[model samples]
Structures are given as C-alpha cells and as structure tokens.
Target: FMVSLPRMVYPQPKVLTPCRKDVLVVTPWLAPIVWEGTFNIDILNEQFRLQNTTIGLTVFAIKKYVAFLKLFLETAEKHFMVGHRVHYYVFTDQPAAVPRVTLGTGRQLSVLEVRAYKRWQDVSMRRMEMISDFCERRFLSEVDYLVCVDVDMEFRDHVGVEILTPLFGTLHPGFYGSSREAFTYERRPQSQAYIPKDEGDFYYGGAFFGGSVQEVQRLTRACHQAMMVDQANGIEAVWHDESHLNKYLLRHKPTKVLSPEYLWDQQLLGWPAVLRKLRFTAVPKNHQAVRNP
Candidate 1:
C-alpha cells in the first residue's frame, strides 16, 4: 500500500502552465513522456524515498562488452539514481572480468555468469530469455522496478526517480521526429514483429526500457515466446529483439514513455536542440569488432 509522504518544501506546481512548450510531454494514452522541466526532482525523490523503493538496473556485457563495465559503473555512480536504493545486475559470461567499481551508500552490484553466444545475433536474441528467467530468480523480490539498458552506454547526467513507473519505453533517438511510415519496424508479415505503414506510436529503442517487476516479466516472456515462434517458422525480424520489443509495446502501450534524453548517441546524433539533456549516452565502438570479438 502507498503511504503519505513526509512534509517537504518544494516549488508549487501550477496546473495552468505546461512544463514544456517545445515538446509533447504526454502521450495520447495519457502517460507522461518524461522530459526535463516536466518534473521536480526534489518532490519525486521524497515520494519514492517514502515508499522505500528499490530499483534494479540490468545490463548485459557478454564478450568484449565486459570492457565497457568500468566506465558505465563509475559514471552511473556519479549520476544514475544517486539517492535511491539501487541494485546493479550485470549479466555476463566472464564474471571475473567484470570491473570492480566502488558503489555509493545505497547501491550494490551482482554479476551473473552465463553462456557466451558465438554470434552477436544469438547474444542479442537470448537476452529476452535470460532477463525473463532472472525476473523469477532474482528481480521480483530484489527490486520494485527494473531499468534494463545497453552496457555500452554511460551516464552523462542525472537519471533519477522521475523515471520510475509501472512500465516505460524510451523513444529512439534516430526516429523521434520521423513519421510512423519511416520507422524501421519489421515489415515482413512472416516475422512476428511486423508493423504495417498505417500503424505505430513510437519507434522505441531497445537499448533502454523497464518497469515494475511483473510488467517487465510479462514483456520479456512475451518477446521470448514470439522470437521462438519466429525461429520455428524460419524467419527473423529486421532488428531482432528490438523488432519484437516494438511489436510488444505497440500492442501493450507503456504506462510511461521516456524521451530520447534517457537514451542517446552523441557520436552519431550529436547534440540536438530538442534534447536538453543526454542522460545516458553511447560510447564509440566498432559494431563488427565488438560483436564478433
């Protein structure tokens, strides 16, 4: 049960004024599309703290991706969910190679060793199964919410309690402004992730997404099952797990939608005027070398 928050002083909210004039801050379904200025951190912090909410951050660092852990962890310590209880779950084949980064007072890390896939496609596809399995084995009891992200990203700015929700998906940095027809969704009817030209809400990035434990489990499980069906039919979606993720979210809309600030690539997309903050960003890497090696 939710409890009342302690007395706290913060700026009073004015319902007459919109938080952002330049952006669409809320989806048609009425879920808030979290952007800076849309929320006051002090108030959000107090509300989450009162509930004693624990957030779990899950990242997969199989093979060469393990090398990205040190910077990811260190930067996360500096910016991601600083004041909340955070549990970092690192899924990798080389647990010993996982770097030792000093965590904050309310933070801890766990490394789960898994079988490394020889191909990058297999590695990417299996994440749904792995994450779904762990939801039962670990996350359900360990955290109130789970924020799954790519291991190659670093925390560039504050990513705090304002992001916690029942379920959320980040808008793809590449297609946030593009029309639904231009979205890179799987087009083949044979593939389970297919989306026709007339349908689509947003092209959500697979690199970052999360929700309450139960919601996450349902999403991952559904994606995994869909992937298995596609495999049996000898067809693969255009973007692998990402394609399935889009299909899932399109059918079952997220309770909250995150703006591109939550996931970005400075090297590729540069600093766009629309994005006030690049909270979590990608590190430069040769895709072929990293995925193969």
Candidate 2:
C-alpha cells in the first residue's frame, strides 16, 4: 500500500519516415528513350502534331513469300524513318502460318484476316474486294496517306514523305504507272489484260504509289463501283485491279510524274549511271551487272 506503482508511460511510436518524392519522378524521367529515339526531329514533330495521320501499308502474303516480306520490313525500317508512326495492315488467309513481323522504331502493325483468293482470273477480283474493305474500314475514315505495296519490293534509301504530300488535285488520282505488257490476262484475247500496244500509260505494280487519304478514298470507291459494272457487262476479268487503276489514272491524270528512277525494277540494270544515281547496290541476277571501278 505504501509503495505506489509508478504510472506506466509508453513513448509514442517513432514517426514513420516520409518518402523521397523526387526519386520516383526522377527515375521515370531519366530512363533512356528506346526504339522511339531513332526518329529524326522533324519526323517526330510531324508524328506528334498529326496524330491522326497513319502510314497505311497493305500486304497479301503466303507461306513462301515470308522471306521477301521480312526483307521489305528491313528496308522499311531502315529507310522510312520519317513517319515512324506507320500502320502496317497485313491481310493473310493463313494468319497462323505467317511468322510474326517485328516492328521497328515507333511503327504500329495491324493484321487482318481474309479468305485466300489466288487464281490469276480471280486475283484482281479478290484484291478489289479486299481493297474496298480496307478503304472503307481502315483507311478512308482515318488515315492521311495510304500506300498499297507488294511484299516483294523494298525501298533502297531514304524516301521522303514529301513525295506523297503533293499528289492531290493532280491528273490521274493514282500517282504511279507501268507498262501495259506487265498486265496479265487469260488465254482468250477477249479477257481483260494489258495488251502490248494499247496506248497504255506507264505504271508499275511494284514500288510505292499513294496520295492524300481523302482522294484515295474517292478513287477506291469509284474503282470498286466500276469493277462491279465491268463484271456485269461481259468484262469477265477485265484489267483486274491494275486495269481499274490505269483507267482511273488515265481519266484523272496525276499531278506529278514520278521519274522511273523512283521505282527502278530489277530489269533496268543496263543503265549503270541510273543505278549509281539511285544508289542501288544490289543487282538482281537477271539484270545486267554494274561494273565497279
């Protein structure tokens, strides 16, 4: 009773240490820019400002052509750095068989599932339908520029986006052309095919040809409509997509004529000077070799 228990007193728990706010913010800010840093300043700015504009690429692929597709991707990755925000729209019947196509820089890729339509007679028919679908769903509504490309081809050097920037309001709405002979037809002369001497304009199936998103949208729609009419009027396989394209171009006429140098084929090796000018290093076996000093 005499000894009173000392009152129990517990010291307040030590205050928890406050976190350093700067560490979290600084870490993310200082991280190295990977993949995106490759683009030139102008391209980066253009991409940021025109976020809606998309570089549309279409490819019809099979199992055998995967290597060529890879080569095209490599070339594109190396040369087409200006618009790093491109959209590669790949259409394949066998999606599983197609190896994954790795994207580079800041490019984006979208794959589309489509039925395979392969017969020569049906290639254009199928392509026209597919093109219509692509235009309506993917390109016409959103993109600023759309380029339809064959997987076999690749760009050799820096191809400035400016080439496509000015194609609107020109003659043939389509910007590129190749020989009529390159066009194929069935056994009967009546079938739609490129005749050797049909007063045809120069255009190539290969190489890059594109224009303002709005103009191409119009062109694709018109072409598809014309195709339906042609098919109904005894034009079983008339000109396929190539013929339709030529017809449209002939009527409209492109504003500018891209020089042959822009899309030099493997057969044009006879001219060494031209190859040198374009900085073409690889010579296809079928074409003449450029002798070096």
Candidate 3:
C-alpha cells in the first residue's frame, strides 16, 4: 500500500535551477543531468527516507584491487549516500584481506566471496553477469536500488541521495564533449555492442551505474546476454563491459543521467571550467600494470 508523504513547510524547496548555463542540464529525451543545484537533496532525502530506501552498492575487488577498498569504503562512508541506509557489498576472491573500514550509523558491509578471474578483461566483463545473477537471488528484497561501480575509485566530494533514481548513468568525462562520430563505441556491426556513429545519445561510463532493483537486474542481465552473444561470434567489444553498457543505454535510455560531476578523472582531465563539482573520480594508475593477469 502506498501512503502519502508528509507535506513540507510552505515554500517547498524542490527546484530545477541549472548550475551551468553553457551545457544542458537535461537531455532532449527528458533525462535529468543530476547536479548540486539541479536537485534539492533535502527533498530527495525525505522522499526516499519515507519509503525506507536501502541502496546496495556493488564493487569488484579481485586480487590487488582489494587494496583500494580501505580508502574506497572509508571515503564512501563519508560521502556516498551519507544518512541513507547503505549496504556496501564487496565481491572479491580474497575476502580475508577486505578492508576493516568503519561505516556510518545506518551503513554496513558484506564481503561476498567469488572466484577471481585470471584476466582483467574477464574480470571487467564478468561483473555484469555476477551482479545480474545476484540481483534475483540476493538484492531483490534487501535493497531498493542496486549500484554498480569500479573499485579503483574514490569519493572526493559529496555523493548523496540526489543521485538516486529509477535508472541513471554517468556521462563519461572523457567523451562528454565529443561528438558521436568520435565516441569510442565499438564500430563493428559484427559485435552486439556496436552503435553506428550517427546514433548515440551520450557516452556513459560503465564504472558507475545503477537503478531500482528491477531495473538494474534488467540492465545487467541484458548486458551480460549481449556480451555472451558477442563472445559466441568470436568478437570482444572494445572497452569490455563499457561498450555493452553504452549500447544498452542507447536502446533503453536511462531515467536520469548523472553529470560529469559524479564521474571525473581529476588526474587525467583535471577540472574543466564546465565542471562545477568532482564527486567521484578515477585515481591515476598504470592500467597495463594494474590489470595484468
């Protein structure tokens, strides 16, 4: 049974003021680009809190990536979903070495044990399968939304309830300004991840994406199924899971689109004038060396 929420004091604060005049806060398709001023967190918090929203954050930390969890979880405790109910699920082969980071009052940690893949590509590609698999068996009842992200990242600023939506994908800081022809989507039609140069709305980073339990389950299952088809055709999508992620969003379209603020690489692109906030970011690392099998 759905119940009505308590009314806020007069002059309700929900507003749609854009923080940047140069860029679009919402896409032509009506997807919102979540930003600080674009949303009022207090309003979002009250709405979600009323439903007892519990967000399940999923990450892969196989082998050496386990080392990143300490700071990742620690910083997340500080910024990611602060005040809301959060369950941090760390999937790793070496659960013994999982971080002992302390979480805030309403948060908790669960170290999910899984086999470590021998190759980085497999590691990256397999997360969708695993998350999809678990969503039905595990997360369906425990949480309202399931968040998928990379472990090799940190929260540099606030990442709170304003980001929550039915489905959301962060615009890649690398390709946000680039035209579709220049997008790094897999060009070969032979692969299921292929997106013709003329037809992409935006390039979304696979590193951060999530939605309601049902929506995320649908996304993961569809992406994993597409990957399987590509694999059977003897093709590997460029950028691994990210390629399939872009293709999936192209077809289904996210309900909300997070701004570059939620996904930035301060070390790679630095802070651009268009970026008002850098919430979650990629720390510099040697990819060839770090992802080495």
Candidate 4:
C-alpha cells in the first residue's frame, strides 16, 4: 500500500541584512541610506558597468586647500570608483601645482583653472555656480554621473559603485542624530534657504554629494539660481551653499540617503559606535590660515 506523504516546505533566505540592525538603511520618506551590508558590491558593480557608467568627481582646491589633493587623490585612486571609468575634475587656480598623481586604466584627471575666491564663503558658495556652468557647457556630454565634493577631505575606505545613484546626500555627521529644532538651518524668512523648525528630514552635509548627470545638473542649476536671487535681494543663507542644499532636498528629496559612514569629522566627533566605517573624513587644519587671502 502506498503511504500518503506530507508536502515539505522551507523558509526563504533573507536577501539583505543591515550591518547594524538598530540602525536604519532608509528614511521615513523611502530614501536609501547607503551603508555596508545594505548592498552587495559585486551586484552593484555589474549593474553600473552594464551602462558603462562614467563618474565625474568634481573638487575645489583653490588656495591652500590644494595641499589636500595629494592625499585625497591618492586615497581616491586606492578606493574611489575602482574598476570603472572615473573623471577627476579638479577646479583650482594653481593648475601647474597640481600633483601628477598617477591614475588607473579608464581613469582621467582634468585641471580646470578657476579664479581663487578670497573669502571662504565665496569659495564655498560659488561651487554651485561653477558646477552648474560646467554641467551646461561640458559635463552633460562628458559624464553619466557627477560627484561634487570638497577638497579638504579624504577617503579612508572603499567608496565605490554603491554610492552611485540618481541623487544622494550624506547625513551630516554633526547633526544626524540631533532633533530638527537644533539643525542650523537658514532661519531668516528673506533668504531662500529658510526652513521652519518643525520641518526637516535630515541635515545633509555639503562636503559630499552626487547623482546622475540629469539630477545633479538640476540641483546645481537650482542652487545657483536660488543663490543669485538671494544675492539680488541682499540675502545669504546661514550655512551658504549647504543651507540651500538642505532647502532643495526638503522639496525635491534625495533618491538615496547616505549614512554618516560616508561622512565624518574624526577630529570633532571621534569614532562613535553607530559608525561601522569612516569612509570619508575631514583632514583638520587651521581654518583661518587656510582661508586667508
């Protein structure tokens, strides 16, 4: 006699798991928080390379900040966008002084000479204008994605294909865990960066941000236009370009949100438990001296 057998079933395996279960990988608004374990590099690499993604990394190294390039570019060569086509766009006054750091296959560097701004604010704020101009005149044809970053920082670990998305912003390490009311948003009603105390999703650090060419160009153009409007009306946002960035993200919202793992101030914040990796960080220096005319 044949015996009846019960059907057998097994639980499906989990596709993804967090590095820190207590930490979040996406925001309440559905933006992705790029962190270790949240993505598989092998998969990311395959997807991006299928499109032959060309990442254009833009950094401003006017005046003393140029010194940071040696280490920045070196570390970047060791970590940033490995195994892909990368265009290192260095905007600086001293093109002749730019170190001849070697690049890998499919990687290139262009030294775009720019007039040095005396005040720190102009140097910081004008990045939007300059990037916007290039986006129109050049980057549109030259790249698939644009990564705008500050020159005074360096990459400490792997910062590769995973961070490449439509539009992403790194959570400012200084204020990520802070309450909305405590964020140093533009408080004045006259400036374009103004945001009410009760309304904030995240305080995005300006030092690191990027996206696909379309989204990045849109962001730069919008930020530059807003700053120009404020300038015509005799107003400047509190945190300058960063303040405008916050305002823009509030309305448009980032398609991806990076955890502080990608941005940190080792000198100020130290190594916190929540941070599994300090991928990018500030290289401390005397600010007044560096920004001096």
Name the top lDDT candidate: 1
State the local distance difference test value for candidate 2: 0.50
The per-prediction CA RMSD against the true structure, in angstroms, equals 1.0, 20.2, 2.0, 7.0
Query: What TM-score do all the candidates reach, one by one?
Result: 0.98, 0.62, 0.95, 0.93
lDDT tens digits, residue span 1-293, model 2: 13333344444433474232211211122321111112244543453445444567666664344445566766766776344467777776656655566667658767688775445345434555676677878776656677665565677766444345423221121222334554442223453332345554444332345566666666667667766776676775444666556556556655443343345454544444322324112324321221110
Tens-place lDDT per residue, model 1, 94-175, is: 9899998988898999998889999898898899999999999999999999999999989999999888899999999999
Whole-model alpha-carbon lDDT for candidate 3:
0.88
Candidate 4 ranges beyond 4 A from true positions: 1-19
Question: What ranking of all candidate models by TM-score puts the best one first?
Answer: 1, 3, 4, 2
Candidate 4, 90-119: lDDT as tens digits:
999999889999999999999898888888
Which lDDT tens digits does candidate 3 get at residues 1-293? Answer: 54676777644544584355778888888988887667767677888887788999999999888878888888898788888899988999997999688778989898889888889989999999999988988899889888899988999899977877889999998999999999999999999999997899999998999999999999999999999999899999998999999999999989999988999888789888877788998877787778775
Comparison by lDDT, 1 against 3, better one: 1
Give the winner by TM-score.
Answer: 1
Backbone Cα, N, C clashes tallied per candidate: 0, 12, 0, 0
Write down the TM-score for model 2: 0.62
The window of 10 residues in a row where model 4 has the poorest summed lDDT is 1-10
Model 1 ranges with Cα > 4 A deviation: none
